[PDB]
Amino acid sequence: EKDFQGMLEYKKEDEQKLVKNLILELKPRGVAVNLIPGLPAYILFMCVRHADYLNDDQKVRSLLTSTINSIKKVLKKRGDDFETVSFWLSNTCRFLHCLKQYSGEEGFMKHNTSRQNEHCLTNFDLAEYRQVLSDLAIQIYQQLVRVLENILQPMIVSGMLEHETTSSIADEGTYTLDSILRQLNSFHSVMCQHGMDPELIKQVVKQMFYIIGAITLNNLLLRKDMCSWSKGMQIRYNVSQLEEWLRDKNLMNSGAKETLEPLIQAAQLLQVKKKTDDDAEAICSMCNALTTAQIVKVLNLYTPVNEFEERVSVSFIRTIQMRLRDRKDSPQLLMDAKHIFPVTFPFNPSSLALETIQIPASLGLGFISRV
Amino acid sequence: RPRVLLKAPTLAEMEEM
């Protein structure tokens, strides 16, 4: 054999049971729903396809509205669980990719098989609905960043600055760099299981690294004891382990390492010579990712390793301030650790043949009929 | 066949009821 159309039919009276079982009560780590990443998106789109086929615009509207409202309900109740937020970000994006891929617009059909093009919508242009879904995905992404940030925040200063250096969860209760890496591993494995777009995973990871670098640099500038040659070495080692993690995950082109540039330059600043005019010119050339206020703070805080090393002189600091005078610089000392880089959801068509997709019987959607 | 551009409630509008 039978050649299915790749659509799903349901009765209007069952629409609320549909979103109840497909959205409200769906477990994000359930086996059945994770056999095919994005399965709820594919199911919803196949339901949209049959509503379009029936020439029923009110049914399309009702299904989309119930879908969007149900996803918001889930995230209001469980929005502090990163697995749930990852899951609906991923499925919201996949639903949007489906609506594009099967829109009938030629720009979105370049990777389509001949069979896939047979599955485009025929009666309705759903561009307005794609905008609403895009807006929803932006909101979910913003919630994802906040949940991940909340999880990492308690680990970052201990792991990056305080603690000195198979993995352990902690060192006698203390968060270490290894704690941070385990947490990043968890995040990444869940996003992958959910089928999150690789370009979106890259953006999440870039955002997380930004937060790590911002919180670390700010606490270096706010404490009195973190500006030393030795701490410079420690930060260098920790950054190199974060870089190795990116390598392990094939994310070295995510832009994540580059968000650490202010912290990286602060660590370098701790380790250069700080006496002559050549030393001063080098600092000014080197520290393009640090504000003048930040450079001056580090130099003031800098602690000699022992008696054979001196503090930075006040006249040296003045020389750098003079050199950086015509910098149209921000007067701020602290990085904005709450900055979120604007997210994008580039089109990611899928190879999945709709006419082959089977609903797992355990999801309790037996009232849906395969067309 | 022409595809008619449907009017979608905005995300905000849906947030009502």
Numbering used by the authors:
A (entry chain A): 1468 to 1632, 1648 to 1853
B (entry chain B): 404 to 420
Q: What text does the study give?
A:
A search for the mechanism that controls the targeting of the Spir:FMN complex to Rab11:MyoV vesicles revealed a conserved MyoV globular tail domain binding motif (GTBM) in Spir proteins that mediates a direct interaction between Spir and MyoV. We further characterized the Spir:MyoVa binding by solving a crystal structure of the complex, which allowed us to identify the protein interaction sites and depict the stabilizing interactions within the complex at atomic detail. The Spir-2-GTBM peptide binds to the SD-1 of the MyoVa-GTD in an extended conformation, forming a two-turn alpha helix at the end, in the cleft between helices H3 and H5. Spir-2-GTBM can be accommodated on the surface of MyoVa without conformational changes in the GTD, and the Spir-GTBM binding pocket is structurally conserved in MyoVb and MyoVc. Mutation of the two highly conserved Spir leucine residues to alanines significantly impairs Spir-2 binding to MyoV. Interestingly, the MyoV-GTD Spir-2 binding site partially overlaps with that of melanophilin (MLPH). Binding of the Spir-GTBM would displace the N-terminal linker and contribute to MyoV activation.
We have solved the crystal structures of the MyoVa globular tail domain in complex with Spir-2-GTBM and in complex with Rab11. The MyoV-GTD is composed of two closely apposed subdomains (SD-1 and SD-2). The Spir:MyoV interaction contributes to the motor activation and to the coordination of the specific membrane recruitment of both actin polymerization and motor machineries required for force production powered by MyoV.
